[PDB]
Amino acid sequence: ELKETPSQTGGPYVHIGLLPKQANIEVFEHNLDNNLVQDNTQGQRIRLEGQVFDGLGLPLRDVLIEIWQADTNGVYPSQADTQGKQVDPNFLGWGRTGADFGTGFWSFNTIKPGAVPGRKGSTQAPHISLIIFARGINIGLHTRVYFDDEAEANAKDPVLNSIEWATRRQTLVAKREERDGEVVYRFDIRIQGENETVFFDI
Amino acid sequence: ELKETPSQTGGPYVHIGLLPKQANIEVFEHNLDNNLVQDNTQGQRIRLEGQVFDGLGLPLRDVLIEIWQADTNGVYPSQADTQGKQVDPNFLGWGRTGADFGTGFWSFNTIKPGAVPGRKGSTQAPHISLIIFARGINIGLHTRVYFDDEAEANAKDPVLNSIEWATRRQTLVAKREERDGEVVYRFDIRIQGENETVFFDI
Amino acid sequence: ELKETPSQTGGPYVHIGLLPKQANIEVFEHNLDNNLVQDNTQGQRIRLEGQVFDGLGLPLRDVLIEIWQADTNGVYPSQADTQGKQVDPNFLGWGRTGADFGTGFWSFNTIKPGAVPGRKGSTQAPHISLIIFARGINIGLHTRVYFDDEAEANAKDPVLNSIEWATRRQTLVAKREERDGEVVYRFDIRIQGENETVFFDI
Amino acid sequence: ELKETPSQTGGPYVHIGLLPKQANIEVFEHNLDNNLVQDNTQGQRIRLEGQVFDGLGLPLRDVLIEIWQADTNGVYPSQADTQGKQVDPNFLGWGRTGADFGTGFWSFNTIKPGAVPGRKGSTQAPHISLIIFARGINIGLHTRVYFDDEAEANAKDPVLNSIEWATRRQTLVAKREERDGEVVYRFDIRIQGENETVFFDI
Amino acid sequence: IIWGAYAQRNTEDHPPAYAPGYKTSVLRSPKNALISIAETLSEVTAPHFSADKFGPKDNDLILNYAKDGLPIGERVIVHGYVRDQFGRPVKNALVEVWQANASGRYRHPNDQYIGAMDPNFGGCGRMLTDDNGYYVFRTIKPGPYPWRNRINEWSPAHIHFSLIADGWAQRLISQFYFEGDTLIDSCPILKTIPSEQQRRALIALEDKSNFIEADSRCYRFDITLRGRRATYFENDLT
Amino acid sequence: IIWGAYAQRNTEDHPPAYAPGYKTSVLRSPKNALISIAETLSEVTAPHFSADKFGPKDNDLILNYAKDGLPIGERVIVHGYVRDQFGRPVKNALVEVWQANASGRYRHPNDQYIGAMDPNFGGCGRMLTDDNGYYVFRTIKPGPYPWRNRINEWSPAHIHFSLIADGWAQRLISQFYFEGDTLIDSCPILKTIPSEQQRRALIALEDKSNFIEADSRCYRFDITLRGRRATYFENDLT
Amino acid sequence: IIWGAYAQRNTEDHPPAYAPGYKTSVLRSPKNALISIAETLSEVTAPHFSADKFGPKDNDLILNYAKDGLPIGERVIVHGYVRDQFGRPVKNALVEVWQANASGRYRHPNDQYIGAMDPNFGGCGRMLTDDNGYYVFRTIKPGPYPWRNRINEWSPAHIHFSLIADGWAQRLISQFYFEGDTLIDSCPILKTIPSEQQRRALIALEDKSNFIEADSRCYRFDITLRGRRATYFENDLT
Amino acid sequence: IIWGAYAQRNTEDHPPAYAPGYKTSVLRSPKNALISIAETLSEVTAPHFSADKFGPKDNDLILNYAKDGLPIGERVIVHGYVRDQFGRPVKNALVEVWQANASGRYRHPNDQYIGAMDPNFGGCGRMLTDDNGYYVFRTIKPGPYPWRNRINEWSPAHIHFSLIADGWAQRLISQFYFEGDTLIDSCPILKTIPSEQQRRALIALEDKSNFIEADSRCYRFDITLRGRRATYFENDLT
Ligand SMILES: [Fe+3]
Ligand SMILES: [Fe+3]
Ligand SMILES: [Fe+3]
Ligand SMILES: [Fe+3]
């Protein structure tokens, strides 16, 4: 047997390799980005945005975020999805973005995911899996984003119920807002301190 | 010379071995419990109660507590007591309880102890020695409970005066209350954070 | 290169794993047994029976026996048979039995095998390969059963002629008897002592 | 923990130390011998005699034998006997003898023992424990002597029934004879070969 | 002999309160250092428990909860001596023990592991040491079990124990493991102990000469508590 | 490829028939040396068993005999590969196994040990290896047990196994033990094997990466059988 | 084959989140322990990227940003295999890389080191592994560089890399160093890794037989990701 | 204390019955394995001998047979302790000893060796151990002697001994040798013992501090017998 290669921080220049356009490098014709909505993509369009804060309450202006999620019917666009259901054919399910260098704000344009089966016949509430990489962070931090308008589904979610300190469950619920026609979910991540966001070892 | 056997956490199932009735096991005829008052026990009956909180401010719902104290005249029911005084013959001086699984509340029915000699001719203020065992706690945490109605005696207590950060001394004073006839002392223990309770290496 | 895994005795409870019905365990729907004759099996039906004796001349009441043999035309029901001949399609060629716990008798219902080619163009006399496993026996003991009514073929058999102590060859010949219509071959095995049965390293 | 001191043969001159009178050495006033019957000893007097044979069927003319047995009521004259019964006060329970140098015959004058409790509430048949020491014998060989006139008790004896090869049980039964008034039990011991006597690891 | 205080607990011989590899210790450990105090009568005394109250089967975990048959599992006797750090025997100390059954399942409302419950096993016992500090109990060897620290964490088989002896300062709870269990090298709770020699002080040893034929195996496990110094000059305890 | 005979069994890699420390071998071992023969079609062939006859739970000793609950004991998966001595996989070989329950008690009329019987455990299973020579079964880890050789003899925990593969010459029955069992160093049956490296070939290893969280541990155990040589010149087998 | 969950990440094989020698980790590490969860479809799935979108020079850092000449520096090829912890090849995984130029200068708005910028070098590339898990790219060896942790901190030369493979649980970002760089023994970021054998798992090795005459040197570097266990009994993933 | 059975004799710590290098064992060893039995009152009891019957010189081999002068030879005292395998003293056990004289000649009708007989030496003695298990006797050191096994076989000097103690199961006869005798490495009877550490357990050691000036040397030799286990649960002996 082999041991996993050890993690190391992505560092402050992670943009060069993962978001070259943010580092002002034009070298690829196709660039991976934060827009998961294609013209024929099914589902309700939503915007996910927030900031990542450090232990002093300051935003990380060099953090890189990726998200992974199912389509509107809760099917993943991956060969490892075993539901036997057809996935939306115009949906990658993944995106990557970087916080703005001056404000630290980050966002994604995506669709609201449908519920996905949990273990042993359970149903998970709608969620988006998210990972954070940055200078100072030695191993990408995994978390999940749930939606405050799915209170019923969140109350029965297996993973949220597996957090025994119940007061911490709320750090994983994003707040719905409607900026003139558009639905926006604000999800701020607090790496350390009060209201520290729950991070998972998955 | 030999080294002390190393400590290990009591774990979440400590009730099986120390409070079987709380784990719903009836195997012993005589069960050790939290009632130190026998019919002929001398002294004023008091109830000691509180909760133990973790670093998030949540109560420990699996903690086990024991207390050790002198009788009403400040004599310990132990052969190691060298005062040459007769101890109350109807007093064990020790009890054990577990926090309630749903609320985390714990209590003891005991009597208010008399003052015990300190070192080099001093007098200690009335106190009860208390130890905490639980999942997550690697070595039982020792603390003392003093009484807020013994301000004069507390101000001269050798151990309290040996804590050089004076603001922390108050974490060891329980508050007297009178629930319709009964005297109750509330003593909440905060393992970590603000107003963290003083713990001793005895 | 790798070394063969070392043998160990099957022990007194070998029935559990190999003849569960003898240990009174019903767990399998199909149980391997000592009947090699199916309704459409070709050849003359014979019964093979005997006892296995130890060095004191007492029977082993916990021995397990298996046999392997060709069909009536001397073809083995195995892909490793290279004769290019069609084997009887209703014949497994193998069976397993256990000595009775009280008497030590064992038996098989099978058919008399046809002659099989030997090395370098020779012909072997009809025989059944047999192996013995039991408490006290560290490695299964291999032997062969030849038939006393095939004297002509036995006198020319390569393996029997390869035993240089000629008086021992007779320990491998079973005796034909006819219990009212049925043909029976009695083959007693003597593990140690006088008339000790020849065992082979194959 | 310590390991037992290893055994070594007593050798051909064992008489010097254990039966000096047989080696013609008069040095002790009290000499241990083969007469277990004192004038006031209770029970029926019997003579136990036989020879010890080697693998060629020849008698050992240098063997030394000891026996250990209970009194007539089956109580041992040892502080380790826990029956709470009074033992015959005129009975040592042990004796030692040597085979005659020319014939190899050995004998003891003793009494027939009563039955002794076995394990878990059982009853053992009357027996005498016997040990053999001699040149060529590296560790004293332990055996037991039972009586042929106690067939009923022998058939239920725990130790005899623990010998799984039943034909060997008879090597432990001595034969009763009556030499004009005297009761004699003949017990020949065969160390090796046919009808080899059962030896125990006790 | 005039007894003085117990020798100081050697903190380097025990686990630290904060040990991040054992996750629940992160929020249940104090942030402040413990405050060491000079001992008084309070710390050198302790309660006395009478043998009169104990049942005849309190130290027999094979039979004390048995209802209509025996518990399933490996029959074992565990015995040993409790001594103080100066080698003196600890007499009449209360030893309480608890453990999972042969499946690694605890008889507790909060244990929902799939390992099967055994209707004839409870898993708790107690006894007082004798004048030589000796103790002996019989039980079923516990099975190792999974628990959630990392998701696939497994603990080697162990029996939990607690001792209340002569002084409150000696109060101790720990657990012992069984010689040769391969999970001993992987357990985050055992690894909270700093030194290899102290991790080894929690391993019970196979005691082959004390096995009982056709019946039970036996393990030997001694326990050492803090000891008191004797005083020959000033006695400031009081 | 034209196959020739199986390579000769290396007698020094197995126990001898006569091994006085295992008492019952004294009267059950031949006095004469085995007679070695040159192989024929009889020795290189073997029967074929079809997977069609096997039940869905034949390799699941936790559930195949379960009636009203699960057996008590340590949940474990055992898996591995069966290869021949030249490293080739052994395909579609019949592997049969048997063992005592968690108490060290066998479900057999002749076992009267006091270790408790488990109404939901049988102790036998079977399976065929796949095309890569791989096999996997699930069971309860067996407990060690006393038996009468010397009066206080104890065997380490073990699972007995039997293999019928491609040639009658490969026929083998043995047993494997579990990594770290301290009784392995004391067993007279294991000590009948001459060499230390072969005694080690019977030890199943803890396979931690394959443990199933909150469920079962896993042990890895590979088996090696005799292998056939290929022929490139004269083929005298027939 | 029915796949079960990925084996648990061995936290002892990676750096801890809080590592005070790497200063910026002090305020960017959580104070709470991570919460381990049992995996679902969410953790075992991952996106698929098609080779169709990739440019012909996406894995050629010598030419992909070259405008009017070649970048200055040491021409090297780096190649290797990506496998999971059970040794299976990882097919069609997205490998993205980035690095400083030959001066140790990154092409990034926030890097103001005096090391000179190279107008013909960009420093980023990508590729998908093939069916054998193999990958190969060409580049200029990066120079080591100073950064502010302690005032005179210097990192050995390294190429940063990222992998998105079959399961979200395998997501990993790390960096590899070059055999013999003396700064490897001094780097606080490399020293966040606990064990010497894991620090060595990040060192690319000189592969002399694969150097291209009068052209380029070659380094060999394999990567291991978490692997999935196969299931043969209950499949609770769904 | 309720005593249970003696611990099982460890057959590997003693010589085997059949040891072809000691020729007379070939026809005087059983062919069948010994049958091990569970102990009863018969095996745990033993006779008691009273000190009253013993003469004042029974443990003084220098004077107990002396008629008109002292025996010729090296004056030595031998002393030591008899303990059981758990270290408990063996009290009031009967120790009988015998040996050749200074010429290696035994006072026995069947010894015709040319070594000279000593009219003032007999060669036998006895004593009971005291409450501490201690014994002491005085004698002439015996000389080594030739015997017929191979034609030129010689045994190192030795004193034969026999013990009858508390249980019949402890019954033992052996012999001890003297530190430094070069014949110890050559003796076929001593070589019947399997292990080097047990061969060394028969060597008496020079005890220089206990030599008596202008009188006698002294050797120290301890003996260990089988020991009884204590019972704390069921007592099936009866
Ligand atoms: Fe536990
Ligand atoms: Fe077995
Ligand atoms: Fe860098
Ligand atoms: Fe001698």
UniProtKB/Swiss-Prot annotation, chains A, B, C, D:
Record-annotated residues binding 3,4-dihydroxybenzoate? 135
The name this protein carries in UniProt is Protocatechuate 3,4-dioxygenase alpha chain
Q: How does it assemble?
A: The enzyme is an oligomer of 12 copies of the alpha and beta chains.
Xref: Pfam families: Dioxygenase_C (PF00775)
UniProt similarity note: Belongs to the intradiol ring-cleavage dioxygenase family.
- What top-level branch of life does the organism fall under? Bacteria
Q: What is the lineage of its organism?
A: Bacteria, Pseudomonadati, Pseudomonadota, Gammaproteobacteria, Moraxellales
Task: Tell me the organism.
Answer: Acinetobacter baylyi (strain ATCC 33305 / BD413 / ADP1)
Pathway membership of this protein? Aromatic compound metabolism; beta-ketoadipate pathway; 3-carboxy-cis,cis-muconate from 3,4-dihydroxybenzoate: step 1/1
Swiss-Prot record, chains E, F, G, H:
Pathway note? Aromatic compound metabolism; beta-ketoadipate pathway; 3-carboxy-cis,cis-muconate from 3,4-dihydroxybenzoate: step 1/1
Keyword check for Calcium: no
Q: Please indicate which superkingdom the organism of origin belongs to.
A: Bacteria
**What residue stretch is flagged as signal peptide?**
none
**Keyword Chaperone on this protein?**
no
Query: What detail does the entry give on cofactor binding?
Result: Binds Fe(3+) ion per subunit.
Needed cofactors, names only, are: Fe(3+)
Q: Which SUPFAM superfamilies match?
A: Aromatic compound dioxygenase (SSF49482)
Annotated Fe cation binding lies at: 106, 145, 158, 160
Q: What keywords were assigned to this record? A: Aromatic hydrocarbons catabolism, Dioxygenase, Iron, Metal-binding, Oxidoreductase
* Catalysis: reaction(s): 3,4-dihydroxybenzoate + O2 = 3-carboxy-cis,cis-muconate + 2 H(+)
Query: Listed GO molecular functions?
Result: ferric iron binding; protocatechuate 3,4-dioxygenase activity
Enzyme Commission number: 1.13.11.3
BP terms from Gene Ontology? 3,4-dihydroxybenzoate catabolic process; beta-ketoadipate pathway
Q: What does this protein do?
A: Plays an essential role in the utilization of numerous aromatic and hydroaromatic compounds via the beta-ketoadipate pathway.
Q: Which PANTHER family match?
A: DIOXYGENASE, PUTATIVE (AFU_ORTHOLOGUE AFUA_2G02910)-RELATED, INTRADIOL RING-CLEAVAGE DIOXYGENASES DOMAIN-CONTAINING PROTEIN
Give the record's family classification: Belongs to the intradiol ring-cleavage dioxygenase family.
Task: Quote the subunit structure annotation.
Answer: The enzyme is an oligomer of 12 copies of the alpha and beta chains.
Q: What is this protein called?
A: Protocatechuate 3,4-dioxygenase beta chain
The species is Acinetobacter baylyi (strain ATCC 33305 / BD413 / ADP1)
Q: Which gene encodes it?
A: pcaH
